Amino acid sequence: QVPTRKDYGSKVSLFSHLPQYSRQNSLTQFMSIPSSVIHPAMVRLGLQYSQGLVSGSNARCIALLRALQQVIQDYTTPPNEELSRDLVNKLKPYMSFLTQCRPLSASMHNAIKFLNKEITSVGSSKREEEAKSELRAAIDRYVQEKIVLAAQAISRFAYQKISNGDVILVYGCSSLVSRILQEAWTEGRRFRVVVVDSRPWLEGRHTLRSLVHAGVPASYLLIPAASYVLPEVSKVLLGAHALLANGSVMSRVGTAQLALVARAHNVPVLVCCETYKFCERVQTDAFVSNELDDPDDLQCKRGEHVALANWQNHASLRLLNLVYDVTPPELVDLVITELGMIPCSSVPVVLRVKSS
């Protein structure tokens, strides 16, 4: 069976229960090249996750769904067995291996649950090719209606709020925010954009490359200086990696800081997210459920010396690399979905109407 990825480096006592791997250590070193566990739709996606080739939550979901479409296409039933249950029992190890490579997100959790429900809903009398074709069609329809149409509707909704001559603050590399801003600028809206980035990923530069390619005037700065720029900021717009039933927002590490300082500076806060990203689980802090990335990314070269070079040789020293955090609902003024413009407190209501 698949081995277990070795935890790298000591961890903070408060984060002892969470795993922490290293990008150098790849699990494929202990797996057959002609993948014998199952066909290698596992390994491509697992390597692109562990090595961080794909980062965006929507990108991760799309890649996972394409890989699982390949899984379904290559899958064949065993004799004297039922597809509707054997498929899920076989698919569970895929999820285990993918979690081993990198912990899953809420969007992928929802996708897995939806596909498991679809497989269960498949009858026991229909033929194999029909079942495979309808599963692929269901995956395609899910992708379409839950990403593309949702993004278009959210852009149409957000076009109302974006007024002329205002300043909009964004954070990180989020496809939804970039598309919203580009489409709004297309419709003749004239405004500025302020980009806030944070170490060590520094993925905010991504959206900057978009904004200049769209001709939008822009500004760029690191997270700590946000308190300096907020007084001239008129609106704050943030993408979200997930929404919880309590109205809190699970997102990149700096989101809660921006929300808190914006509230302290009396600035409205907008959170744009798709309905499929809504998650039923709840939490009150980033300690219970998070993901610790490779701490080696924290090392930086200032001058001619790297302070954290031999951090392993100091027993007392510890490094943490958080990737997610929770923003309390009371600091959020909007959730922009295809269903419309809702408050955070109405997040569970959507979960009720989309479930049936």
Partner: protein, 190 residues
Amino acid sequence: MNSQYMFDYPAINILSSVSYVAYNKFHTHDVSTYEHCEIPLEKLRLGFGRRNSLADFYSLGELPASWGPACYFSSVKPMMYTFQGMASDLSRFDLTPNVLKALSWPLGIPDCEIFSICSDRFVRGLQTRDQLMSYILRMGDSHSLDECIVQAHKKILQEARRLGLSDEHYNGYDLFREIGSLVCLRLINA
């Protein structure tokens, strides 16, 4: 979302005919009503006000929610079109020199459907909608109904300029009446 609710969807098939289908759900774009015909404003934007001279709307990228005789509170300030009598008289004619090229417009190939549309015995009900949109669909060069309306109004205005008809007298309140009046005046000119 009360503006986005539309009852009948004009599906487009590409001479350039449309088909209205039962689509009773909220649309992704604002939908305007003209002569009981529903036009999705995918390319344009909803506009308000009772301003005359419908060209005043799409000049700003807008289009009224409702206008025409089908609306008791039309927002284009209706007028009279005191030239439809000869159109009604000639409506009973068939497709059959200078006369043929006079009615070669609008499609460029001579036809007589407009006079049947502009006939006195024309009650603009549900069943009469389809061809009209198809008719409009033949006018413009686009794939959206609102863009076809705009291009048809441009053609009407520029020919009215060509024949000198004092466009302040031609506000575009009723498109088919404009078409009939212009065609009849061109026929009588030669």
